[PDB]
Design an enzyme around this catalytic site. Sequence first.
Site, PDB file in Angstrom:
ATOM      1  N   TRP A  20      50.717  46.361  32.437  1.00 52.12           N
ATOM      2  CA  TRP A  20      49.465  46.115  33.146  1.00 52.12           C
ATOM      3  C   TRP A  20      49.739  46.728  34.509  1.00 52.12           C
ATOM      4  O   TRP A  20      50.593  46.253  35.238  1.00 52.12           O
ATOM      5  CB  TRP A  20      49.157  44.592  33.283  1.00 52.12           C
ATOM      6  N   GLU A  70      31.357  30.552  34.353  1.00 52.03           N
ATOM      7  CA  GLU A  70      32.018  31.062  33.138  1.00 52.03           C
ATOM      8  C   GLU A  70      31.112  32.098  32.455  1.00 52.03           C
ATOM      9  O   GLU A  70      31.558  33.124  31.984  1.00 52.03           O
ATOM     10  CB  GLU A  70      32.264  29.862  32.231  1.00 52.03           C
ATOM     11  N   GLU A 128      33.184  40.724  32.678  1.00 50.20           N
ATOM     12  CA  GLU A 128      34.448  41.109  32.114  1.00 50.20           C
ATOM     13  C   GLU A 128      34.320  42.103  30.968  1.00 50.20           C
ATOM     14  O   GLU A 128      35.050  43.034  30.913  1.00 50.20           O
ATOM     15  CB  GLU A 128      35.076  39.856  31.527  1.00 50.20           C
ATOM     16  N   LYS A 162      32.260  35.958  31.909  1.00 53.79           N
ATOM     17  CA  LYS A 162      32.321  36.574  30.598  1.00 53.79           C
ATOM     18  C   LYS A 162      31.586  37.876  30.593  1.00 53.79           C
ATOM     19  O   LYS A 162      32.065  38.820  29.981  1.00 53.79           O
ATOM     20  CB  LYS A 162      31.670  35.730  29.491  1.00 53.79           C
ATOM     21  N   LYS A 182      45.312  40.259  28.749  1.00 54.95           N
ATOM     22  CA  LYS A 182      45.012  38.933  28.296  1.00 54.95           C
ATOM     23  C   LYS A 182      45.661  37.948  29.257  1.00 54.95           C
ATOM     24  O   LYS A 182      45.088  36.933  29.557  1.00 54.95           O
ATOM     25  CB  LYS A 182      45.536  38.704  26.859  1.00 54.95           C
ATOM     26  N   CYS A 197      53.114  42.631  32.641  1.00 55.11           N
ATOM     27  CA  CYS A 197      53.922  43.498  31.737  1.00 55.11           C
ATOM     28  C   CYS A 197      54.902  42.714  30.894  1.00 55.11           C
ATOM     29  O   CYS A 197      55.205  41.569  31.235  1.00 55.11           O
ATOM     30  CB  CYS A 197      54.802  44.475  32.525  1.00 55.11           C
ATOM     31  N   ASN A 199      59.094  43.702  34.860  1.00 56.97           N
ATOM     32  CA  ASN A 199      57.851  42.949  34.872  1.00 56.97           C
ATOM     33  C   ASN A 199      57.841  42.278  36.200  1.00 56.97           C
ATOM     34  O   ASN A 199      58.703  41.467  36.459  1.00 56.97           O
ATOM     35  CB  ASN A 199      57.868  41.981  33.742  1.00 56.97           C
ATOM     36  N   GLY A 200      56.941  42.678  37.101  1.00 51.07           N
ATOM     37  CA  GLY A 200      56.868  42.023  38.421  1.00 51.07           C
ATOM     38  C   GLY A 200      56.353  42.967  39.466  1.00 51.07           C
ATOM     39  O   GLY A 200      55.691  43.969  39.140  1.00 51.07           O
ATOM     40  N   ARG A 217      50.434  40.959  27.500  1.00 48.09           N
ATOM     41  CA  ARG A 217      50.869  41.082  28.883  1.00 48.09           C
ATOM     42  C   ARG A 217      50.374  42.384  29.522  1.00 48.09           C
ATOM     43  O   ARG A 217      50.452  42.516  30.754  1.00 48.09           O
ATOM     44  CB  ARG A 217      52.402  40.889  29.054  1.00 48.09           C
ATOM     45  N   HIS A 240      19.690  30.297  49.830  1.00 45.99           N
ATOM     46  CA  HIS A 240      20.234  30.163  51.170  1.00 45.99           C
ATOM     47  C   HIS A 240      20.810  31.512  51.555  1.00 45.99           C
ATOM     48  O   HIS A 240      21.753  31.559  52.297  1.00 45.99           O
ATOM     49  CB  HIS A 240      21.338  29.100  51.232  1.00 45.99           C
TER      50      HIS A 240
HETATM   51  O1  G6Q Z   1      23.073  33.527  56.321  1.00 43.87           O
HETATM   52  C1  G6Q Z   1      21.939  32.989  56.354  1.00 43.87           C
HETATM   53  C2  G6Q Z   1      21.901  31.567  56.887  1.00 43.87           C
HETATM   54  O2  G6Q Z   1      23.135  31.529  57.605  1.00 43.87           O
HETATM   55  C3  G6Q Z   1      21.972  30.546  55.745  1.00 43.87           C
HETATM   56  O3  G6Q Z   1      22.933  30.965  54.782  1.00 43.87           O
HETATM   57  C4  G6Q Z   1      22.395  29.171  56.210  1.00 43.87           C
HETATM   58  O4  G6Q Z   1      23.842  29.122  56.470  1.00 43.87           O
HETATM   59  C5  G6Q Z   1      21.911  28.098  55.232  1.00 43.87           C
HETATM   60  O5  G6Q Z   1      20.476  28.089  55.042  1.00 43.87           O
HETATM   61  C6  G6Q Z   1      22.297  26.761  55.831  1.00 43.87           C
HETATM   62  O6  G6Q Z   1      21.353  26.435  56.860  1.00 43.87           O
HETATM   63  P1  G6Q Z   1      21.811  25.784  58.264  1.00 43.87           P
HETATM   64  O7  G6Q Z   1      23.021  26.530  58.803  1.00 43.87           O
HETATM   65  O8  G6Q Z   1      20.641  26.030  59.201  1.00 43.87           O
HETATM   66  O9  G6Q Z   1      22.061  24.339  57.910  1.00 43.87           O
HETATM   67  O1  G6Q Z   2      38.084  35.562  30.839  1.00 45.40           O
HETATM   68  C1  G6Q Z   2      39.185  36.135  31.065  1.00 45.40           C
HETATM   69  C2  G6Q Z   2      40.343  35.252  30.882  1.00 45.40           C
HETATM   70  O2  G6Q Z   2      39.634  34.099  30.360  1.00 45.40           O
HETATM   71  C3  G6Q Z   2      40.931  35.011  32.296  1.00 45.40           C
HETATM   72  O3  G6Q Z   2      39.956  34.645  33.280  1.00 45.40           O
HETATM   73  C4  G6Q Z   2      41.953  33.883  32.305  1.00 45.40           C
HETATM   74  O4  G6Q Z   2      41.291  32.592  32.168  1.00 45.40           O
HETATM   75  C5  G6Q Z   2      42.818  33.925  33.568  1.00 45.40           C
HETATM   76  O5  G6Q Z   2      43.456  35.174  33.776  1.00 45.40           O
HETATM   77  C6  G6Q Z   2      43.871  32.843  33.453  1.00 45.40           C
HETATM   78  O6  G6Q Z   2      44.607  32.969  32.254  1.00 45.40           O
HETATM   79  P1  G6Q Z   2      45.271  31.701  31.546  1.00 45.40           P
HETATM   80  O7  G6Q Z   2      44.215  30.831  30.975  1.00 45.40           O
HETATM   81  O8  G6Q Z   2      46.100  32.216  30.386  1.00 45.40           O
HETATM   82  O9  G6Q Z   2      46.170  31.076  32.611  1.00 45.40           O
HETATM   83  C1  ONL Z   3      52.936  44.613  34.902  1.00 43.69           C
HETATM   84  C2  ONL Z   3      54.004  44.483  35.876  1.00 43.69           C
HETATM   85  O1  ONL Z   3      54.825  43.522  35.883  1.00 43.69           O
HETATM   86  C3  ONL Z   3      53.920  45.603  36.921  1.00 43.69           C
HETATM   87  C4  ONL Z   3      55.210  46.400  37.048  1.00 43.69           C
HETATM   88  C5  ONL Z   3      55.002  47.438  38.126  1.00 43.69           C
HETATM   89  N1  ONL Z   3      54.724  46.720  39.405  1.00 43.69           N
HETATM   90  C6  ONL Z   3      53.972  48.503  37.748  1.00 43.69           C
HETATM   91  O2  ONL Z   3      54.242  49.235  36.753  1.00 43.69           O
HETATM   92  O3  ONL Z   3      52.920  48.637  38.420  1.00 43.69           O
END
Ligand code: G6Q
Ligand code: G6Q
Ligand code: ONL
Lengths: 608, 608
Positions: free
Chosen positions: A74, A481, A488, A485, A603, A1, A98-99, A26, A504
């Site tokens: 916000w 990224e 978002e 995007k 933003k 905010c 703001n907070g 903000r 995995h």
């Molecule tokens: O959740 C599913 C399995 O847990 C899998 O995600 C596993 O963690 C990876 O295939 C790593 O294999 P290993 O744990 O057998 O090295």
């Molecule tokens: O894509 C959305 C914005 O890109 C958002 O992800 C932003 O990168 C973060 O909220 C951090 O903001 P700052 O770059 O201003 O610190």
């Molecule tokens: C945006 C901000 O600083 C929030 C103020 C307050 N917590 C709210 O209106 O939710």
Amino acid sequence: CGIVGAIAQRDVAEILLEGLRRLEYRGYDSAGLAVVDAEGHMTRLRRLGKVQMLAQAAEEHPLHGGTGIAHTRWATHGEPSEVNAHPHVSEHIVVVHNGIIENHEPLREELKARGYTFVSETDTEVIAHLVNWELKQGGTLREAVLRAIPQLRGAYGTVIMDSRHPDTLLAARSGSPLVIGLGMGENFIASDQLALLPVTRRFIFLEEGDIAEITRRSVNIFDKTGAEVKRQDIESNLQYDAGDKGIYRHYMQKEIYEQPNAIKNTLTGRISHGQVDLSELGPNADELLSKVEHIQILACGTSYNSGMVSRYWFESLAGIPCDVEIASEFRYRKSAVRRNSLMITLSQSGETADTLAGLRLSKELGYLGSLAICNVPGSSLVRESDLALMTNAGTEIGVASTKAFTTQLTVLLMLVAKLSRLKGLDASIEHDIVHGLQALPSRIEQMLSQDKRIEALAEDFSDKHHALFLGRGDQYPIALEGALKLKEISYIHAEAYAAGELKHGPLALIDADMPVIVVAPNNELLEKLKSNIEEVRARGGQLYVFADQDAGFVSSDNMHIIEMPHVEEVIAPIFYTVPLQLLAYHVALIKGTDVDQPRNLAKSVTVE
Amino acid sequence: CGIVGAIAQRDVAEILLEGLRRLEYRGYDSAGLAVVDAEGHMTRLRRLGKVQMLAQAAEEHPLHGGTGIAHTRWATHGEPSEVNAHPHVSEHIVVVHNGIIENHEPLREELKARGYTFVSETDTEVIAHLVNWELKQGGTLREAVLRAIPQLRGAYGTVIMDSRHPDTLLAARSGSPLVIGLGMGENFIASDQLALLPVTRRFIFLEEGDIAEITRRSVNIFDKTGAEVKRQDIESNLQYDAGDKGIYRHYMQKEIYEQPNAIKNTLTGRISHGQVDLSELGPNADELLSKVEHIQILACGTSYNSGMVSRYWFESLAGIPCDVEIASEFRYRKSAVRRNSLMITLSQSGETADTLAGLRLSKELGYLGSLAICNVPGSSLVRESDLALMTNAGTEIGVASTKAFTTQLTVLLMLVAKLSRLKGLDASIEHDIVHGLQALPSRIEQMLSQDKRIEALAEDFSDKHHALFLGRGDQYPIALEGALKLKEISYIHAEAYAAGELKHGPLALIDADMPVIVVAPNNELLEKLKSNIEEVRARGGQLYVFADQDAGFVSSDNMHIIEMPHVEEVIAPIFYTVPLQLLAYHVALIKGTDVDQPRNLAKSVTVE
Ligand SMILES: O=C[C@H](O)[C@@H](O)[C@H](O)[C@H](O)COP(=O)(O)O
Ligand SMILES: O=C[C@H](O)[C@@H](O)[C@H](O)[C@H](O)COP(=O)(O)O
Ligand SMILES: *CC(=O)CC[C@H](N)C(=O)O
Ligand SMILES: *CC(=O)CC[C@H](N)C(=O)O
């Protein structure tokens, strides 16, 4: 905010509203303002919606008076609604905030037991009521705030007013920024300098815990212990750039097409005799930078992705250990911390609360110094870092970072180049980096010309509710990224994975309907990446590959290719970002969503 | 994939089939077997689906003969089908393969250009056609293989046979595991030891680039040029643990309810009068562990997650720098090494190719040494590392890791305690670690009594297709684990975020229909996490919070609490996992999926 306050003899309604336009980065959930005339008569106006909604309402019924506060939101506590919009009241007490009051729960129940009625669901409202209660007990407004603040927990950038006494405003800072603007026979306060430039250039920055008692004729600041202190005033040379769409239909769109020029501005005066010249950091910066044996980066969202990219560069090109962490996570764990570590923050706005809190914590931990790579001069992160490198991309309005991401990665690479030379590595490493960077503007300018094909492809996501992104190596954070995007601004549930990870577990999401987006430069990782691709096709996924002309991919019913020009490997991750930005933009256009100001977002996130 | 082979006097089909059952943890998309007698009559039989399909079809028309190769598939190139199933043929050539032939496309084209017709979409087919082509040039199968292997890029544990000469099998290791079982009057080959224990306890592991010529009477091994090498034989004491469902409806179900026992076993012998004892490592383990200034962990999937939990512990409790990386990403980047670094791998199967690859690269990089935390004695991972800590959970059958994860966390924490004391930190750290670990089994026991509540709660996800998971601090990797569990076995699109990051873009996904699962212990981050939760409720999301009994959460229409018993902070992460394991299982049941054997997956991904 965003908050603004003003105290003068003329009406301040317009000054307050202009301030809000300028602080809309903000929050755009709702906005309000309250003014009081010399007789103590208060007019409060609030609207669910963007600042312009408020402006319109004010123009049909002007608010008269020389004292006032304002707010743009916000929402954190309670859904956006006129009821929850600031300013919040407790009879004659009026408050913008703001907070976040983290202990709003106990306080609320305690104030309820003393008779107060909560009409909103906000945490902010406890501030109004608490201050009201403290004043009942006797004393001046300053004394009341001084007894209240200590009871609050969490962050507050607040400006408090008693409409029975329009001569005085109380401001208190914890976490959230507050800047006081000094006028001539008037005074102002706002979340940032840019909001108040129309009326003044002389500013005081409140320190953590300061309280300021403000009248038209005076500013008296007290520190956290209650001592009366002098803060220094600066003269600012900042210039407010409101930004523009130009010929474009959206700010995001213009911002995407501006990158060649944006990048060109980031390089300006930093390439000197073929070499990265960071002389702007000051005459003895090379002294500090040469001690660097480790790099720590804290950032959030997209800026965090840019950090993740740079990590592959620091470690492989310059041989320098790099750690990149979600700021909010670093803030609240006890971390080991390495020897001779440089603290780097990455942030477009310079106002992100999580990133700030990281930085502030870092000051207690004994890094060698802090560097801010930022795009907004005079911002919080800049004022609070040791050193700053400005990305110089121009104002970015769309919530979805674009030119900020690529200018950020550009600046990171020039740092990688600079440190390779201070370590005394092959001058060739920097050379290949410099050659790459100089080429990027026109490399991107050429990626832009494939817009039509990306647009056509985008049609395929019109009925889609999911999307997987895949990347390898320094292209992995590019997948991140990309997914960010797309989720978002289109609201598609998009998700990224390092190409090797999918099998995995998450491979089980793959069916005939799941689109899978892939960036594939022609590099040493290509064969490995192709076999991950094949794994997906074997399960019926539909692939969308932004592949180098030479990668040897072949179009088919389950495999849609966009052929990319061969680029220098060092700048590939920046390069392959652009088409992903375009795809997101075009899918948002299809879904009919608000590209520039997506739902639920702001933003810059100024709270935790 | 799992390969089995056999050269006997008697029919080896049954030996081959039992091999496949014991390798089904490596693949269950399809399966095949090929057998020839002495006279030369080969009968090939292949089936889309589980090993059981193959076993049924072979029970109807039994495959007679003493020479044979077998295979069960995890598909990477071409969909699961009978056409795509191994063995693959090229007239008399017959091939089974565990690996990926990365340069298959160039190879396939050259072989097509020479009159070969490819019947399948697999990379494996090139191996058969290329062995057939080399043999046409001249000499023995052994010499043909020796010219073909060099032309293959990527990985391969393949067994080759010329049906016209059923007396001799060929075998080639690259990356992939290959163990030879020495019989009396007979010889064998398999992906792992346990598959061959019904027939032999004497084994030979092939090294990187080894070609084996195996009759029922002799075993000769050769290197890459063709020079005969001598490989030592060992006697295994390994016991085959088939896994059971006990009284339960699924293995995963059993394996969840068995965590308290499994952790009890994990601990046996490692807790000495309130102190951690790791003497099992050998008499000079401490010489090494005292040197450790940095920890590098490598893993995948759930194992990567346990690694992530431990980074918070290592850095905060032992004050030791710790990095965790996706095995697949570390392997193909040029990293910067830290002084005095201990390489840790985490793996339930010890059979994960990326992790293995990670660990092999590590030996060229100059770490202090290599510790493996594995759950499978004598696996590739355990053999190939300097040091090992067996989790002792008993074999886990369910694709989705339950007890394996919590036992890995148990061991990691013991290690954290062990290092804290070596660095000479306060003994109170180890005390609380050990004290917490001792309570862990009975705490879990008291968690599972809330199975019913979870089950009723699962009923809300029947119609859902998305889920978001949030955690902070050490509970953040637990959010990742919950989301990975839900994806894998319910196919719902679950995604986790560090709680404070959601607002940086991904919050746009929130609407009235989005479930948000949150883990909320009653610790010092509780009020921060609560802000994040309120930010979600402000935008309409349906919250599911697993919260300590006293966290002060209250039920609402958009707020479903599952109250959790109090737990020690140190073991909280381990504790809060268990309810997410149950939610995943119950939801999978609701969705009517194959819990123990989900679509697209294999219990252990033995390829890249
Ligand atoms: O959740 C599913 C399995 O847990 C899998 O995600 C596993 O963690 C990876 O295939 C790593 O294999 P290993 O744990 O057998 O090295
Ligand atoms: O894509 C959305 C914005 O890109 C958002 O992800 C932003 O990168 C973060 O909220 C951090 O903001 P700052 O770059 O201003 O610190
Ligand atoms: C945006 C901000 O600083 C929030 C103020 C307050 N917590 C709210 O209106 O939710
Ligand atoms: C499991 C495995 O080794 C894959 C073999 C081959 N690429 C296939 O059948 O797809």
